[PDB]
Amino acid sequence: SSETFVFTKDNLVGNTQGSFTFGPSLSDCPAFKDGILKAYHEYKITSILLQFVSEASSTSSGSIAYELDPHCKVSSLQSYVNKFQITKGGAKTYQARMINGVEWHDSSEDQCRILWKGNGKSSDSAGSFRVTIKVALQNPK
Amino acid sequence: SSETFVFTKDNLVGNTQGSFTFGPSLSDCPAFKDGILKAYHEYKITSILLQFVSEASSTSSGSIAYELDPHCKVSSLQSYVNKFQITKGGAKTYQARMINGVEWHDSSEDQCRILWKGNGKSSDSAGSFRVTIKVALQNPK
Amino acid sequence: SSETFVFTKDNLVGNTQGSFTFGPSLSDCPAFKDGILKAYHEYKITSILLQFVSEASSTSSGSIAYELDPHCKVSSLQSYVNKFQITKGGAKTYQARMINGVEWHDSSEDQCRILWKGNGKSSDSAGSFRVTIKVALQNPK
Amino acid sequence: SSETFVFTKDNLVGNTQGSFTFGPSLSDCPAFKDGILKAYHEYKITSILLQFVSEASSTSSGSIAYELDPHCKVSSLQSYVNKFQITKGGAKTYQARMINGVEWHDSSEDQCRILWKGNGKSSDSAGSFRVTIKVALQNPK
Amino acid sequence: SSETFVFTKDNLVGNTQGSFTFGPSLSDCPAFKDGILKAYHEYKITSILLQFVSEASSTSSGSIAYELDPHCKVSSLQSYVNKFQITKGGAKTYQARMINGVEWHDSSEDQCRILWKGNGKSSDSAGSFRVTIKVALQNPK
Amino acid sequence: SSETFVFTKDNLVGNTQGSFTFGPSLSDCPAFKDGILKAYHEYKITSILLQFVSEASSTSSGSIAYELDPHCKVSSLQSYVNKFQITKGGAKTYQARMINGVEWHDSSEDQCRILWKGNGKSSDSAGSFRVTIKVALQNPK
Amino acid sequence: SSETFVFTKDNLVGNTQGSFTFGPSLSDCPAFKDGILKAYHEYKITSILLQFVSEASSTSSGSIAYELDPHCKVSSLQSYVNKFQITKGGAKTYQARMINGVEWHDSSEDQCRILWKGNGKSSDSAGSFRVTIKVALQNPK
Amino acid sequence: SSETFVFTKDNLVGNTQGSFTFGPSLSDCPAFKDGILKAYHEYKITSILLQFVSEASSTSSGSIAYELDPHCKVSSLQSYVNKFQITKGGAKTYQARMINGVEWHDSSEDQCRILWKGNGKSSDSAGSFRVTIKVALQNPK
Amino acid sequence: SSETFVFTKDNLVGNTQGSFTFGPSLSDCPAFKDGILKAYHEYKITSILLQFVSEASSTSSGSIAYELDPHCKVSSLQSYVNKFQITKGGAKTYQARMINGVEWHDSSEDQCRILWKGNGKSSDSAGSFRVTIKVALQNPK
Amino acid sequence: SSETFVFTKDNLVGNTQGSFTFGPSLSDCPAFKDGILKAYHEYKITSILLQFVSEASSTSSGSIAYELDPHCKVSSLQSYVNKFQITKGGAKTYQARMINGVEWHDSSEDQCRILWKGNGKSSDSAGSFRVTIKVALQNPK
């Protein structure tokens, strides 16, 4: 009973922060939060495609960094290894073994938490994060 | 992005009535009503397996009748051709061409409406209707 | 009797809105509106290639969002999942099964309605939307 | 549960008009109007063979025109492309894809409407239209 | 982007005259005149099937003559070589090399002009000329 | 006796206009205007590669539109279907059948006329149009 | 309906001039001028064999030059590239692609114009130009 | 970008002299002098076919001699090894290695200079020298 | 016992300088400096992928240059051959033979030193240098 | 004894000019000027890769043009056919036959001269021209 869910993030300022805690704590996708997840005992997210779609001016400087965090144990970013540019948007595709997606998780367990943090100005705009998850569910409820 | 949904109906009295209006009007499966259906533009239900699982006494007489109604245009049963027995439960599997399931339907359109009506006593119990739908969705939202 | 039609949209401001209701309600392509469509009973649009060709400055911030809406039932955008950037233009190709293009439609029936809505400034310019439709028609009139 | 129905039209004057609205509005075939159609939920007409069998004098001038109209949306002819001659009768065979006969229609939905209009005299006679439909029905009622 | 267009001529008297100047001067097919032709720079008509469908009495004498004229340079018939009979209708199929249909023509250039002239009575009727053109267009506008 | 000719257009302002009337009216390539063309009776241009090479600032907004016009009959643009962006330059390759390049043309006949028209500011600069034509000539003079 | 026509030019003086404008302006071949050409709408000349048959003395100096001119646009010679000798006569065979003989021409259109001009004395004699054309005609009139 | 050029020499007297300095100093072929050569940086002439086409009387005595001179360093003939006869004309074909045609030459460099000198009378006429060069050019300008 | 290490450089100003002295002198990767390197006698770095990930405005001019220096013997850049652009970031992958990575190095020996030096402004920002090294170690300690 | 040489050009202003006269007159590569060239009698440059590596702001307008000039005979540009953009840098690879690199040149002979000329502002910066030559030398000295 696999299903894909596409959800977006709103008009983002350049120094934005946040976290996509996947599972029953996605406030940004209610069709997965209290939609398909209330009708099954256990799930796992097979893949996560996180996409930064930037409507930003070409004179805006900065870069929005992100980390995967496969076990939901951090609340800030704390690691600036890989990052998107605010002018030129990007995309990152996470497979199953990266995102704790090989074992079945209970429907009250968060799976993984992608976090971001930008360093741009507090007046520019880079509203983005089209996110496409592929989730599989097996035990109906 | 296909997905199966299993939902049940509660403790049924012998002279029960009702309707399973599939689509955005299933009050009996919220994980399909305002779950996966709010995250896609259009859907179609590929198959419907309606199962009558009877916990009824062997001295209870009656038979619960049902009809398919592939276009949601009737509110009562009005046709007693095929039916389940209250003592011996049954099962009926509907494929795609029977249930208006060959074309994509908008996510505010009801697809088909299975109706039932029993003729048993108002004191017996035959709580049943394990229903398993296979639905496909394509245009994310 | 297949035929391709290319039509454009005019000088677009950055916060533009609108809708391309395909069929007999395209005000932007009269050669399909009251041209080839008045000489046939029924049609279907096999494919739609919507292209955003941006003549915009590299210091203009914003992003024009769009949705497909395969059944003409919405008048505003209401979904910001996928979008073009105003600086870097884009292209999106819709096949037949996405755009209600598998069954023949009567020549007074609108088929699908692509909508857009931008979030840029009301002074910038991103004049765009070269649209190429492939339509098939069979029953002459 | 396929079945063929042959019905005729009466003694036709040379300037005759009319329409064969197929489905539950055929007044000219009651064995399909309130016969086999009241015992099934949904139908589709697989083929329509319309035949003009003319008993007309060889000195009568005129030609009876006809159109298919696969979606019941016109009440007059309005298109004189193809036509029968009043002296020499004819025949026209419509397959499934022409007559909106690929999807199942509800038993209160008209499917297609063949219309005719002649230009002969109001005193001649060309009584005709042996019509043979092949209809399939699946969901009993 | 090839397309076929079928258009007819109205109730014809026996001594009828006229001309089918193909291209942007067909007054008898607006779906080709200001329909598909306004959306392309250049075209060519691949084939022309001219058909005389006669609803005429068998006591009406006469014959409607026609000529091809592949370059639009004559306004009357002036050549009675080939002709249809008013009682027994006919058909003539013109390929590409006959009708100046090997090179691309601009969308303000008439291609060829089929002319007819009958010698029957001014009271009889032979309403006819179902014409089917196959046109190809390449450069969108 | 095939030969390729590369010629450029000068320092272009953002709202530029013009036309490349190919043949004996190219004022921008004298080596083809009164060079190789005075020594042959007839020619044809096999291909035309029009390239927009932009030295423009990334804060300059606008887009230079162009059309092919295979028969030299228009003096303004009048069609804004396809276009280059002033910031990001482009390229368009026209084959033989598009540009009236299948038949031999006399050396006093213009073949085709590519036109452009921009909508940028009258102070910016996008000096461009490296054009490469492939021409064949056969009858010496 | 192909046909060959052989026509000659009269007693030529050594400094002769002229032109063979092929089509409806050949004054030197009336069997092609107002013979076979009045009975067809369109023609094309498949080949032209121009032969210089010299009855000239071996002490006469000079050379008669000629050019092809595939589009009837020049009235004098203006090009002395290839030429016959007045003493030793010659022959030149022109195929279809040289003489504008690949497309059908209307019967009031001149096709090509071979011109000659000699430089001999005004008292010598070289009477010549046996010309053999192969012409094809298709649309009768 | 290879191309062939055919140019002739005018009415020649029997004791004629001259030189064909190939490259940018051909006064006898302007379509190569300031035609195709102004649009390329560098060239080389692949072959030279020099042909003596004599319209001379059979009682005129003499012989026009010629030399190749692959490096443009002589202004008179100075070598009478090979020669044409004034009565019987001739032809000489020079390949690439003879005429300094293996390396690319700049477009302001003369390549080779064929010279001639006749010994006939100053009253006879042998107007001739149909010359056909095959030139290749590579670097556009 | 191969292992990959990804480390980044902080918020970089446009005129930044520095050096990545690989081995026991990486102050920017302590998990390789006094992590895995204290537990082995000898190592070698198999590959180095240096990536410039720019969050810089599109109106910032400059270019950050870099050199490899396979033997740690220079402290400034002194060579501006290859370089990244501050607006458009880049990537450079160094294999084993380039970076002195074919022989085993002692764990107190620096291997190679990549240096950079930019020429941008002292107010812009291009924070970058995601560096991924692949190191192999063999002799435990 | 082939060898590659990489040399750069310094901090370039937007309206820069110059020339790379290859051979013993490269002032920008002394390791080829009075390095390897003083130890051999004759050389030839097999290939030249000229690369424009731009550290320029995205609001700087202009384009730096260049020409090849395979024989060192021009001192200014004089031809604006192909060019780089100042914002988006580029690359051009010249093979052996383009750059006079098929014959051996003496070590006091310049081979070819690439010239450039920009049209940008006199205050912007686009410091660039990483040039990589492949040279072969055979006769030691």
Author numbering:
A (entry chain A), B (entry chain B), C (entry chain A), D (entry chain C), E (entry chain B), F (entry chain A), ...: 68 to 208
The publication says:
The Luteoviridae are an important family of pathogenic viruses responsible for necrosis of the plant vasculature which, in turn, causes severe stunting and dwarfism, and ultimately crop loss. The structures for BYDV and PLRV each reveal a luteovirid capsid composed of 180 CP monomers. The CP monomers each contain a single canonical jellyroll fold, and are arranged with T = 3 icosahedral quasi-symmetry to give a particle with a diameter of ∼30 nm. The luteovirid capsids are formed from CP subunits with a canonical jellyroll fold comprising two opposing β sheets, each containing 4 antiparallel β strands (βB-βI).
We therefore present high-resolution structures for VLPs of BYDV and PLRV at 3.0-Å and 3.4-Å resolution, respectively. BYDV and PLRV CPs assembled into monodisperse, homogeneous particles of the anticipated diameter. Structure refinement was carried out with icosahedral symmetry imposed, yielding density maps at a resolution of 3.0 Å for BYDV and 3.4 Å for PLRV. In both cases the N-terminal R (RNA-binding) domain is not resolved in the cryo-EM density, except in the “C” conformer of BYDV, where an additional six residues of the R domain (residues 55–60) are visible. We have also solved the structure of VLPs formed by an N-terminally His-tagged version of PLRV CP to 3.4-Å resolution, since the formation of His-tagged VLPs were previously reported (Lamb et al., 1996). No differences were found between the structures of the VLPs formed by tagged and untagged CPs. For instance, mutations in the CP of PLRV that affect aphid transmission can now be rationalized (Kaplan et al., 2007). The triple mutant D95E, P97A, K100S had no impact upon capsid formation, but decreased transmission efficiency, suggesting that this region of the CP may be important for transmission.
